[PDB]
């Protein structure tokens, strides 16, 4: 039975690279989104033109019930989910002194609470079948802290604490949970940044996708509760 | 003036120990809570604390509370974000409410409480913000995906807020305690903690809250102005990295 | 121009797993050794693999320079360098001798300098390099009876970070791979009931790691998809240590 | 029954700051050096002008026998050593391309081997007595790596490996072992552009600040801090 992967924000700069890599690894891939049908349709179509057959689901990862409804559809089509990539999130940048409580919640409830809201929908299947791969997308900015992002940095760091506890809980049931923590990436939304990066360039979404593919393969069963940093050397210990 | 400290959860096991050390260091200490008797034993003890009610999960409650505090003291120089709770459960069994109660109180507290006092610390070019983490955010812990997520997130906050206040005479650090001899933990039967707890701690004993308070009293001094964005681990050797 | 890897301690439990993966990936592999390399080479040959092997004392700069002379002559160049060679000389710090200390410092840490020095200039010139240094989970958490081993392995990561910084603009990455307890012949010699009593409880995943798994992660690190990983410590320890 | 501290490099910018802090905390303090008697006796004089009596001792921390000799003297004089501060150290900066074996060896044999060479001479005392404090001085360059310092970064990183293991082995005998990891300091050395933009607080640390921290760790309120790395780097490095 084919391995199934669910990639939240699966149509993003990094979600779409991850999805393509996981499909090319031979998995049945579902991607999550909150966009209008035309966006989703054109995306699905061009992917179909590049040899790739995706199925997409609408979700609000900040909303538990919505995750429940989303998971329902996914499980009905693929019947199980083996590989979960918590990749969906948002930024709401403000200096701390300017930050509104609204800036704060949008980022906590979405970026961090997604660890509970989404992973809750799939964890029983993984434990039942004694197999799973959960990769939580962190950020270099949860490691080093960032100016203007007290909220996004608190969420990415919290994400690692969740990675570690889940790994401890699921280790003995064939499931590994890891944080992958990318630096700045040549995405669509993305001289104060580049000199920050020893390697002297943005990382490619596909590079991060490659590392993720490895973590979800059968060769990475001894990596759990780890933070994999892939940042162009922008941050070290 | 005189140095003024606000210890959220200031009457709790660690909070109490902390409030007493900042007091004995020459600070005028306000203690937050969610009372009368504790305050009696304390003035009695030799110290004068002012208690405020607050719900650190609730911004509004925080902002109201700061108003009383400041009305009374003029300023806040030293902020100890110590208030926290656990709602433990395996992930499989953890409810939306377990998860949520912990995020709001333990991690949202960082924004809510801190938002109230940052303004004056920057104006007065001085501040000591000390966020209480946990060794359980550092290494992770069974039954506590919520707690470890919240406590780990606190250090993202520490690190960003130390970067933003760096040139303003303010330091922001996390202190991560291991297992402490608070009244809760001392209720666990001797044989149970010798079986499940003490063998985790190379030093072979619970850490006193006073010790943690002593470390924090140091970080809040002028001598520690070059310590910022650090996580100081005081866990008896339970975790190293 | 088939990519070339050099693997110090290349016939050892983990070293051997590494050489096989890198060989199966299409890389030309040279392995280093400090007795029965004949036998090791023979068993590899039986398994369908061509390795060239080289004697060296990694703790000896002049020894490493001679070894690289021969390797470079043979293979033309080294694109991938695996500093895997390592010994332990365990003792409580109170019983440990200067010999226990020196043996581990020279072989495990000085080696980082002695070896990498030989191959660095070629990588800089070609504007491509991969360098992976093997650390240890005992570098990260420290370990009873291994003040020398922990010190050496911990020190390897200081090395990796500095060389990553220095080399990042010349197409070179440098990382540390820190493995947990692995099922090597040595360790498999342990009675299953001692392994179960004392070793496996430390490991949340509940088994030793297979030297091939660690080798697989390193093979990913050495590919054209790993260019944006550098100065990194990748822990592959089955949940034994987190931070 | 006063506590005795021994600070190697006890006359350097940081070393001297530390010795002053420990003395003012009530400790008898011995200091190690490898300087000529001229320099030493004068250093001693100004300190004594300030109302501090130190005893100073020659040692080569990169040399086991030397350390053994130095330590007998200390011990004959003060009877014991309760607190050890491994502070002595050097640098031999170069790019990896340019660094020589000698550059490498001088940094490793001195900065990292000192953990063994020095601490071996005092560890037994602490254990028998069931009380000790060992503070090993690392470096922010240990944590982040530093261009030009492949040797010194390795030595300084190596030092926490040592800290964690010895914290483990001694934790039941009332001893803590910690690394204190300072960023760039105001030492007559650095008071000799590139640096400060690295430091979020926008200034050099005072050696005295580092010494305050270490004075806390050596005190009786810090017995639950062990195997830890305390960073005091102005924000220069975080997690």
Residue numbers in the entry:
A (entry chain C): 3 to 192, 202 to 248
B (entry chain D): 3 to 36, 42 to 248
C (entry chain B): 3 to 36, 40 to 248
D (entry chain A): 3 to 194, 202 to 248
Publication text:
Here we report a functional and structural genomics effort that applied saturation-level transposon mutagenesis and next generation sequencing (Tn-seq) to identify essential genes in B. thailandensis, followed by high-throughput structure determination. Using only seven Burkholderia species to select orthologs of essential genes, we solved structures for 49/406 essential gene families, and for 56 total Burkholderia protein targets (including seven ortholog replicates). Of these 56 targets, 25 satisfied criteria for being a potential antimicrobial drug target.
One strategy that has been employed to improve success rates is to “rescue” such proteins by adding orthologs from related species to the pipeline, based on the assumptions that many of these will have slightly different physical properties that may improve their solubility or crystallization, and that close orthologs will have structures sufficiently similar to the original target to be useful as surrogates in drug design. By using an ortholog rescue strategy for insoluble or difficult to crystallize targets, we increased our structural coverage of B. thailandensis essential genes from 31/406 (7.6%) to 49/406 (12.1%).
